[PDB]
């Protein structure tokens, strides 16, 4: 569980990702690609995208980052009551696109990052503390949902 004033922070640095949802999906995929190339290779048509410009100018692409990060957001602002959201996702996830647990913790990585070269001055110690302990609550609960539609995280 978190406490409520880690919920605040997470919430409080989550409202400043909204600001530019496209530019921060943008971001966390350029990152994540580059640091585990494993990664870009489940994200298929996205494999002709050789640099980083190529990367920014694709509007698919970037839907692609805004849906992610809107369904993140959605989750986080349940504070973890979000069995809700994260069932259809960890189906998908699970089934679909066959997604390991630790691509979610490289992507869990990026986000973290990301949120700190872009806001400094607001994602300090307690904020991240915070933010990685809302990301590693959802990916406990969403490694259980996975087992629960068979097969591991
Ligand atoms: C915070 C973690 C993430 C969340 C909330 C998330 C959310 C979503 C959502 C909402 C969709 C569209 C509907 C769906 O198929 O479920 C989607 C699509 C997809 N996601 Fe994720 N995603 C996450 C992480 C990942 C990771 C780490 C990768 C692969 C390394 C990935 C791969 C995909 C792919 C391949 C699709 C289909 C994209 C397509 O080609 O259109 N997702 N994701
Ligand atoms: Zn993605």
């Given at each position: 569980?978190?406490?409520?004033?880690?919920?605040?922070?997470?919430?409080?640095?989550?409202?400043?990702?909204?600001?530019?949802?496209?530019?921060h999906?943008q971001?966390?995929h350029?990152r994540?690609?580059?640091?585990?190339?494993e990664?870009?290779?489940?994200?298929?048509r996205?494999?002709?995208?050789?640099?980083?410009?190529?990367?920014?100018?694709s509007?698919?692409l970037?839907?692609?980052?805004?849906?992610?990060?809107?369904?993140?957001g959605?989750?986080?602002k349940k504070?973890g009551?979000?069995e809700?959201?994260?069932?259809?996702?960890?189906?998908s996830?699970?089934?679909?696109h066959?997604?390991?647990?630790?691509?979610?913790?490289?992507?869990?990585?990026?986000?973290?990052?990301?949120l700190?070269?872009?806001?400094?001055?607001?994602?300090?110690?307690?904020?991240?503390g915070?933010?990685?302990?809302?990301?590693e609550?959802?990916?406990?609960?969403?490694?259980?949902?996975?087992?629960?539609?068979?097969?591991?995280?």
């Amino acid at each position: 569980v978190l406490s409520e004033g880690e919920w605040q922070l997470v919430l409080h640095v989550w409202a400043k990702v909204e600001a530019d949802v496209a530019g921060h999906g943008q971001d966390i995929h350029i990152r994540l690609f580059k640091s585990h190339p494993e990664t870009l290779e489940k994200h298929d048509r996205f494999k002709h995208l050789k640099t980083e410009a190529e990367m920014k100018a694709s509007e698919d692409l970037k839907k692609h980052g805004v849906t992610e990060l809107t369904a993140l957001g959605a989750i986080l602002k349940k504070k973890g009551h979000h069995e809700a959201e994260l069932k259809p996702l960890a189906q998908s996830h699970a089934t679909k696109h066959k997604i390991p647990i630790k691509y979610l913790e490289f992507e869990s990585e990026a986000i973290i990052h990301v949120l700190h070269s872009r806001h400094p001055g607001d994602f300090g110690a307690d904020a991240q503390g915070a933010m990685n302990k809302a990301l590693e609550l959802f990916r406990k609960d969403i490694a259980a949902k996975y087992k629960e539609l068979g097969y591991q995280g």
